[PDB]
Amino acid sequence: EWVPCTKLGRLVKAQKVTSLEEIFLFSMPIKEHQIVDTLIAEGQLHDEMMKIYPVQKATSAGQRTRFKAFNVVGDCDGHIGIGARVGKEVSLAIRASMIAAKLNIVPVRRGYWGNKIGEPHTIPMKVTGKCGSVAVRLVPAPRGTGIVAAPVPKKILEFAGVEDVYTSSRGKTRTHGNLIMATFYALRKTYGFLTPDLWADTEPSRDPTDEHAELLAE
Amino acid sequence: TMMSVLANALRTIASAERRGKRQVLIRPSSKVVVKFLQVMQKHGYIGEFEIIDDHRAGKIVVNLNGRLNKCGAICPRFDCATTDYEKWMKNILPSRQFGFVVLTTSLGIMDHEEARSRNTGGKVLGFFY
Amino acid sequence: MSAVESGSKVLRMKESDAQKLLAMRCHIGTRNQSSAMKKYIYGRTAEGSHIIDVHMMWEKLILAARVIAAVENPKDVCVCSSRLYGTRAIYKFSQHVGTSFHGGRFIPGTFTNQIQKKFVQPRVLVVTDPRTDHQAIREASLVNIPVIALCDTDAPLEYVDIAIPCNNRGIKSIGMMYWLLAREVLRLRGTIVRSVPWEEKVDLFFYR
Amino acid sequence: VRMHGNGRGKASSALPYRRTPPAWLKIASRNVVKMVCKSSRKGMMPSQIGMELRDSMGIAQVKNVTGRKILRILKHNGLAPEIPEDLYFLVKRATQMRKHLERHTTDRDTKYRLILVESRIHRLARYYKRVKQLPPTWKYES
Amino acid sequence: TTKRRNHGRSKPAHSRGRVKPIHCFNCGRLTPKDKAVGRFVVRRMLDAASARDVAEASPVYGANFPMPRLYMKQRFCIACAIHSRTVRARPVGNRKIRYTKKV
Amino acid sequence: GTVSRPRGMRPKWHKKRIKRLKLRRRRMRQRSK
Amino acid sequence: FFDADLSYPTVRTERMKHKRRRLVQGPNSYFMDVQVTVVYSHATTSVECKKLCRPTGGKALLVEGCGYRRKPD
Amino acid sequence: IGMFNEEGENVDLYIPRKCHATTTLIEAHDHAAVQISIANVGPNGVINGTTTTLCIAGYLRSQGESDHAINHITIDRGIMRIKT
Amino acid sequence: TKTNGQNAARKLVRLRCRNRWADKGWKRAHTFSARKANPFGGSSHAKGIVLEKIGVGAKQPNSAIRKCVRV
RNA sequence: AGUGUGGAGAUCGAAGAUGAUUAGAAACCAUUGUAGUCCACACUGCAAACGAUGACACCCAUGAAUUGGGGAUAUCUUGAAUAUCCUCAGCACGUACGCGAAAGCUUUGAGGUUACAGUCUCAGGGGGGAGUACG
RNA sequence: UGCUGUUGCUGUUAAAGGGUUCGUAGUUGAACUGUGGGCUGUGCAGG
Ligand SMILES: [Mg+2]
Ligand SMILES: [Mg+2]
Ligand SMILES: [Mg+2]
Ligand SMILES: [Mg+2]
Ligand SMILES: [Mg+2]
Ligand SMILES: [Mg+2]
Ligand SMILES: [Mg+2]
Ligand SMILES: [Mg+2]
Ligand SMILES: [Mg+2]
Ligand SMILES: [Mg+2]
Ligand SMILES: [Mg+2]
Ligand SMILES: [Mg+2]
Ligand SMILES: [Mg+2]
Ligand SMILES: [Mg+2]
Ligand SMILES: [Mg+2]
Ligand SMILES: [Mg+2]
Ligand SMILES: [Mg+2]
Ligand SMILES: [Mg+2]
Ligand SMILES: [Mg+2]
Ligand code: NA
Ligand code: NA
């Protein structure tokens, strides 16, 4: 049973927040993973384990082995999240990484290569994400090319909802902890790029907590 | 020494836009710099700008709105036939939906879309988006 | 922020509160200055110290008071003081405006450790000196919380949004400015009136 | 400064934007040209002539009053230096350096500076030969 | 791996080329004068008890007239400075602390 | 300290060895010539 | 509380700048009246009337006992 | 405002806040971007229902230039007087 | 860093020609020393006559007698 | 450092001598000492010859300093110096973007680069063999 | 295989800036000669 501990969790439980778009718009952090389970419909948040590998810390008698788990979450329709957690046992790491992945969900802007008919199918502009030595570059592609990418970025992009994209990589891509995060940062950056379609000014609106301050007072 | 006035000006503009300034001083100026600025202005990427006369190569103060992501010069000014526009857009522009390659042509300095409409080639000056 | 939509000067400085600013030494500026506070300084005096012009000081005080008054729930505004000379002024401001408060050492994780109890999620933060209240300001920058600060001349203005140039060290100056902020905020509400001078006496606003 | 060394000094004149002579300057252009020629006839190069006119006679710029630069006036009157002024001064410096090095054969720093001065002399002589301000076969003799 | 931004010496990249060495006060090792550890020592000639005994026997020295001191500028090589504990290895964060006056 | 692990002996003495080797080879060939 | 305009700077900012760092460069020097002669403020060529001024590294020093008036432009 | 098909549908997932000071899009994970509500004052000192809200991008906060930007905003919006 | 001039083609051509020799594979492909030293003379296979059967000990940490022939 | 020819030859000191230490000690330590160390003239052209960071040019945040020259307007000696501010040029220091595998760098870039183009130039392409062999 | 790199590499510590200058082919090289004007209609032009 979920008993919220933050104001945003209380507003989500009270149903006065109906989408993740409202949280994204005001840049509010998500501290309880149940918010994402609530705001995304049943059976529409796909998860997957991306990589599990051991890490060792040397000790005066041998070494201590823990496990790092990387989890991807997404609705295949413009929302993606990456979680990475360490645990003494594999199952603990997997569960914690699923929760962390749900916590780190982000919007992905999708666009068109040429003519704008149908749903957006590709990224709206060239983007690059870097983590360590690994950099992943996403290039818009026409319809029908699919995801021309290595398997790990391919899986992440599939969970993000991108159908056609050219991809280039550099650095030590076998460092998969860095590759996953580099792809995530490339995707997260699609909504920060100012396009002529976003030149028109916006009316600033009050935050959910501002408008439901009295409700959260009780 | 300074070898390209246009490259210097466009690097200055890109630095000022990257650091969030609203005005930038350009020095020295030339006719080609003014035409490039006017091409950027025609598409709304910069605001109003003023040419200061010093009886020398002048100075320009450009008013920057937040629309300009990056502008830069292409050196050397490569030849571009009418069939090379797609290649340059693929190579140097963020997408086919926006952004411009600026060219100098015998019909004058213009962006790539207007040049393709006039069916003229020329030398590539730079880009902005 | 004395300008209003109607053009009235109801919120301008009445010269009946200015001599209080001059009286409690609210302009002496620690002989040190920062780039962000170059604007609020009028000049350098004898003995090598800076003075804060009172026009901009009062304008920012009005802006902060109006921002505080825009909050429907006074408990949504937390006011903090790591320095000991602000604790009593903090208590008095809170007990007269309804704002939350906390003095002394700031416990890290207060605004970010959700599951720890004593974890609070204020909407606005008011601090007495951004240098000494640095930890609260650092925590606020992780949770979308704007910061109002009483800033001296050498104030690091990193995550402060409304800086009030003042004297951050004198007991009398801190008490005077907090009393002024409380009075102005209560005047923006209907609780007191402009014509009648406030009954509250400011000597007990000082610490110990 | 920049040529031959790490000097990056910026000191120089800043000519005024308003080019018209001051109203209190009541010397006619022909008299200024006469002054320039008289100074040249007393063995003064254009730099020194301009400096005397600026210091003692209130003539900030000869070109702004007469419309002509000082070396142009000297050329029109047959008074221009046989070899250009800057080249003359560089050759004089090189000659003095060589005279000093005749006795001081271990002043290696002066030998270095002499190499720099002679390279400068050759680059300038090349320029002046190209613009026909020097004869062909003009030779710098050490 | 560069341990120090100054490379253990007071000689910035474009300040000067060569600084003439000096002999270590202790071992004689030649050390660039900028790099060496320099201390100026003002030392009493006798300790307090010897000073009292000598002042008791002196018409010159007493409460009115101080006894002379020793003055020495001592420059050490790094090994001798460390060994005599005039300077010690410090934690990485504390290595940047510089004292300009005697304390 | 002040250096990383060499492949064999101290490089300056290895260079001195190769120097003595070259001098000996030069002497040998000047003998045969 | 006023944003500076690069095209129209304040006199306080422009007064501080080096003569070639100004928005439009220009001289620091002037002419002065000291018969009455005209002397450059930065004369170095031993101006005479008796010497009227002494050359230095910057502005020449006018000799004591003679009156000096700065000229326009 | 945003992307559209040829059919006229708005296909952007959401329209992010564009800061009035920096003219940059506020990201979902900015977490230092803030919104400040500055109250409107009537003929007298009493506060009415309506309020003015302004957004500051998080990087502007991180660089210590947020107070300056809010000053210029309140000068532009008529909230705060430019001079005496 | 590299030269960029519009008429600087000769410098780039000479530079690439010189530096192509540093690639070990390219150098082996464009020289005769490997083909000369190669017992097969550049062929994929070669016929030979068995001289003797020999046993070659495997390298550490393995331990075996690898059966070979001298041909 | 080394080479040649003259000179010098106090000090220190490769070679060497003697005494210790040691299992041995051709070492470290002690006492010495040749060549050298110094000068003129002529060679040699190698250094962790280092900022292990090529040269020229542009932009670039903050505070306290420092060297030289200028500009404007409190103290001390009798012009010099000092004070406040500004300025050009120089060697740097502390705490912003941004960058980097990190250590770190940061108007003194290693920043302004996959959003990859100011100019010229040198070098590198797994470790050894080897800066060896041959010319 | 962006491990030959024009597109498109690396050179503080991983391989790699020449000890420092001078300098000839070579490469590269600052501005400037230049807003065409009137007339009617038409356009979320704008102050
Ligand atoms: Mg050292
Ligand atoms: Mg020097
Ligand atoms: Mg050296
Ligand atoms: Mg030292
Ligand atoms: Mg060690
Ligand atoms: Mg070490
Ligand atoms: Mg090494
Ligand atoms: Mg020798
Ligand atoms: Mg001797
Ligand atoms: Mg001896
Ligand atoms: Mg031993
Ligand atoms: Mg001995
Ligand atoms: Mg190799
Ligand atoms: Mg490589
Ligand atoms: Mg290197
Ligand atoms: Mg390196
Ligand atoms: Mg190396
Ligand atoms: Mg050499
Ligand atoms: Mg040269
Ligand atoms: Na085995
Ligand atoms: Na070094």
H72 touching chain G per CB within 8 A: yes
CB–CB contacts below 8 A, A to C: 27
Q: Is E65 exposed, middle or buried (0-12, 13-18, 19+ CB in 10 A)?
A: exposed
- For chain B, the structural domain boundaries read 1-68, 69-129
Looking at 3.90.1310.10, 3.40.50.1100, 3.30.1490.10, 3.10.310.10, the CATH number of the domain B69-129 comes to 3.30.1490.10
- DSSP-based three-state secondary structure for A129: strand
Task: For nucleotide J62, give the residue with the nearest CA to its C1'.
Answer: C35
Please give the torsion angle defined by the CA atoms of residues H18, H20, H23 and H27, in that order, rounded to the nearest 10 degrees. Answer: -30
Query: For chain E, after which residues does the C atom lie more than 2.5 Å from the next written residue's N, i.e. where is it broken?
Result: none
Q: How far is CA A102 from the centre of its chain?
A: 8
Q: How far is CA G28 from the centre of its chain?
A: 4
Interface test with A, best of C72, C100, C111 (most A CBs within 10 A): C72
Cα I47 from Cα I41, distance rounded (Å): 12
Question: CATH second-level architecture of G1-73?
Answer: Single Sheet (2.20)
Q: Which residue of I has its CA nearest to B74?
A: I4
Which DSSP string do the residues of C158-199 spell out, in sequence order?
TT-SEEEES-SS-HHHHHHHHHHHHHHHHHHSSSS-SSSPP-
Is the domain spanning B1-68 CATH 3.30.1370.30? The answer is yes
Instruction: With beta carbons under 8 A apart, name residues in chain G contacting B50.
Output: 7
| Nearest chain D Cα distance for residue G60, angstroms | 10
D17 touching chain B per CB within 8 A: yes
Please, which contacts does E95-98 make with residues 24 or more away whose CB atoms are closer than 8 Å? E95/E4
Q: Report the separation in Å between the CA atom of D120 and the middle of ligand 19, taken as the mean of its atom positions.
A: 10
Contact E72, E41 (CB under 8 A): yes
Q: Does any strand J atom come closer than 7 Å to the Cβ of E14?
A: yes
Cα D59 from Cα G71, distance rounded (Å): 13
Q: Does any strand K atom come closer than 7 Å to the Cβ of D129?
A: no
Cα A191 from Cα A189, distance rounded (Å): 5
Using CA atoms, how far residue D11 sits from B28, D7, D53, in Å, is 20, 11, 21
* Resolution to one decimal, Å: 2.4
Instruction: Give the pairing type, strands C77-81 and C124-127.
Output: parallel
CA angle A199, A202, A203 (to 5 degrees): 165
Q: How far is CA F10 from the centre of its chain?
A: 11
Contact A167, A138 (CB under 8 A): yes
Q: Report the separation in Å between the CA atom of D4 and the middle of ligand 11, taken as the mean of its atom positions.
A: 55
Q: Which residues pair with A111 in a beta bridge?
A: A122
What residues have their beta carbon closer than 5 A to ion ligand 20? I 61-62
CA angle H61, H64, H69 (to 5 degrees): 70
Please give the torsion angle defined by the CA atoms of residues C136, C142, C143 and C145, in that order, rounded to the nearest 10 degrees. Answer: 50
Q: Does any strand K atom come closer than 7 Å to the Cβ of B106?
A: no
E73 annotated binding-site participant: no
Cα A86 from Cα A98, distance rounded (Å): 12
Contacts of A13 (CB under 8 A, 6+ apart): A2, A4, A38
Contact A9, A34 (CB under 8 A): yes
Cα A4 from Cα A12, distance rounded (Å): 9
Closest CA to C188 of C49, C28, C74, C52: C74
Contacts of H58 (CB under 8 A, 6+ apart): A27, C141, H26, H30, H31, H32, H33, H34
Contact A107, H28 (CB under 8 A): yes
Residue with token string 């439009």: G24
Closest CA to A99 of A47, A40, A50: A47
C-beta atoms of H36 and C161 within 8 A: yes
Interface test with G, best of D55, D61, D62 (most G CBs within 10 A): D55
E35 annotated binding-site participant: yes
Instruction: With beta carbons under 8 A apart, name residues in chain A contacting H14.
Output: 21, 24-25, 107
H24 touching chain B per CB within 8 A: yes
Distance I47 CA to J133 C1' (A): 34
Closest CA to C167 of C136, C128, C126, C208: C128
Q: Does any strand K atom come closer than 7 Å to the Cβ of I29?
A: no
Distance A176 CA to J26 C1' (A): 59
Task: For nucleotide K6, give the residue with the nearest CA to its C1'.
Answer: I12
User: Which experimental approach was used here?
Assistant: cryo-EM
Chain A positions contacting chain C at CB under 8 Å are 5-7, 26-29, 31-32, 207, 209-210, 213-214, 217
SS3 string of chain B? CCCCHHHHHHHHHHHHHHCCCCEEEECCCCHHHHHHHHHHHHCCCCCCEEEECCCCCCEEEEECCCCCCCEEECCCCCEECCCCHHHHHHHHCCCCCCCEEEEEECCEEEEHHHHHHHCCCEEEEEEEC
Q: Report the separation in Å between the CA atom of E32 and the middle of ligand 21, taken as the mean of its atom positions.
A: 13
Cα C136 from Cα C150, distance rounded (Å): 14
Q: Which residue of D has its CA nearest to B53?
A: D17
3-state helix, strand, coil in chain C (%, to 5): 35, 15, 50
Q: Is the peptide bond before E12 cis (omega within 30 degrees of 0)?
A: no
Alpha helices in A42-164 (DSSP H): 90-103, 151-160
Structure token pair of residue D20 = 């018209």
| Nearest chain G Cα distance for residue H37, angstroms | 21
